[PDB]
Design a protein around this ligand. Structure first.
Ligand SMILES: CC1CCN(C(=O)c2cc3ccccc3o2)CC1
Ligand SMILES: [Zn+2]
Ligand SMILES: [Zn+2]
Ligand SMILES: [Zn+2]
Length: 459
């Protein structure tokens, strides 16, 4: 039960308008053969062009929605649409390109996939809502065979060049003309009633239908993301490290401790209501405060309604003390809150386009996050940068330029000049802070929060 068997059945009903007379009885083995490919009884790591839903979920970073719409099959020009928003027109002699022959179209395809995927995945997974032309056009830009490595590096080959007879990964494919050993999944095989637009529109209002192939390619990948990450959630699937994952997670832990410690010192709340992670630990273990935990898993569809989290009869009084919502996305935060909210609009290799304005944030695990909404924070203000420390001014053990900063809240800065230890610690914390902010996180705090109240914690 590793890969999808080629002898598995393929429902051909969705294919019979572009392919009239298609047999109802059909396997992946026969379909691949009909697509013009020959698998030659090869036991070399590529057992099937098509993959299982479980394999697609593990390779979500590789997903590229793909759709082909006939402008006028062998005689008529095709419109190739991709979930990148690209539309290429191929002649057989929302970015719209004029009609060009396949020999130049395939070059643009390799360029586009390589630029989109090089920092995301070792492969491409073509996400389809298959009607016929997308499958029968694959032979014009795809070559298959045994699993290979890049000519210039150790990564698996994802491209082929007919000019040099060589193979390359997404990083070394400049001037390559064929997509090598791609993967694909037909969403129509999952059991749906009705056309793509009707099933997509049940869950998403952000993607519209202009009737161009890229629009359908976008709706397909969106529907696939809703099915695999919004309605069905799996926090047991690990994902490889492709960027600053560890540094961002470490920075997040440092910022949480810093912000929560300072709020408890500035406003001395008697109780803290920690809403979120059922496996959460006190971020400030030495604080005097009464720490009360409330379990809520990450919401992947719509943000939690504060009325359902707090009401229906716990301290009961959430109005007492402070509330901490560290990645616990709610519709409107109460005024007495400390909040970390991920901004779904952020551009990064970790954040993939999602469903209904939301985004698929992939960092060790995949978390579909509801659309960032500025109105959730009307009772709060943006938390400004500050570094706070009550640790002794003692260096122990990198060089030095004297630090001067109004936001270095330490005994040394209070007393006039920042010590070397607190200057090192301040710069490291500011680096972690910028990492976390640029990863897409946003910090919000109750309006009375004032760092001026921290200077008196040194007396
Ligand atoms: C897009 C965000 C990125 C950071 N996330 C978490 O670190 C996380 C883990 C967890 C477990 C339970 C409740 C909330 C939780 O947030 C997921 C959300
Ligand atoms: Zn390479
Ligand atoms: Zn959508
Ligand atoms: Zn100091």
């Amino acid at each position: 039960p590793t890969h999808l068997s080629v002898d598995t059945k393929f429902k051909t009903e969705g294919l019979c308008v572009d392919i009239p007379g298609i047999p109802k009885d059909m396997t992946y083995r026969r379909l691949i053969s009909m697509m013009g490919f020959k698998m030659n009884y090869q036991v070399n790591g590529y057992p099937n062009m098509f993959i299982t839903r479980e394999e697609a979920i593990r390779h979500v970073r590789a997903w590229i929605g793909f759709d082909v719409e006939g402008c006028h099959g062998t005689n008529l020009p095709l419109q190739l649409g991709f979930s990148t928003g690209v539309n290429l027109v191929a002649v057989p002699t929302p970015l719209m390109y004029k009609g060009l022959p396949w020999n130049v179209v395939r070059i643009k395809i390799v360029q586009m996939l390589s630029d989109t995927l090089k920092n995301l995945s070792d492969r491409v997974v073509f996400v389809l809502w298959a009607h016929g032309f997308e499958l029968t056009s694959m032979k014009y830009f795809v070559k298959i065979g045994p699993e290979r490595t890049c000519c210039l590096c150790d990564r698996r080959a994802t491209c082929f060049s007919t000019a040099s007879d060589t193979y390359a990964c997404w990083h070394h494919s400049i001037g390559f003309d064929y997509v090598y050993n791609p993967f694909m999944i037909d969403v129509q095989q999952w059991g749906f009633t009705g056309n793509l637009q009707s099933n997509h529109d049940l869950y998403c209002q952000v993607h519209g239908n202009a009737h161009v192939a890229s629009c359908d390619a976008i709706m397909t990948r969106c529907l696939a993301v809703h099915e695999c990450f919004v309605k069905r959630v799996d926090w047991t699937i690990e994902y490889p490290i492709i960027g600053d994952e560890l540094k961002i997670n470490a920075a997040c832990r440092k910022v949480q401790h810093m912000v929560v410690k300072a709020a408890l010192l500035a406003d001395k709340f008697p109780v803290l209501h920690d809403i979120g992670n059922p496996k959460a630990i006190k971020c400030v273990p030495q604080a005097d405060v009464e720490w009360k935990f409330y379990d809520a898993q990450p919401c992947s569809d719509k943000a939690y309604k504060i009325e359902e989290l707090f009401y229906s009869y716990h301290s009961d009084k959430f109005t007492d003390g402070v509330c901490l919502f560290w990645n616990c996305n709610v519709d409107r935060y109460p005024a007495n809150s400390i909040v970390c909210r991920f901004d779904t609009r952020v551009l990064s290799n970790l954040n993939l386009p999602g469903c209904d304005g939301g985004s698929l944030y992939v960092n060790k695990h995949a978390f579909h996050t509801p659309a960032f909404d500025k109105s959730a924070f009307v009772n709060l203000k943006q938390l400004p940068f500050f570094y706070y420390s009550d640790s002794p001014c003692e260096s122990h053990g990198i060089d030095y330029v004297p630090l001067k900063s109004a936001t270095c809240i330490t005994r040394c800065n209070l007393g006039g000049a920042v010590c070397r230890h607190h200057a090192n610690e301040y710069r490291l914390y500011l680096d972690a802070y910028n990492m976390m902010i640029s990863a897409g996180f946003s910090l919000w705090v109750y309006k009375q929060f004032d760092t001026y109240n921290l200077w008196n914690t040194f007396t």
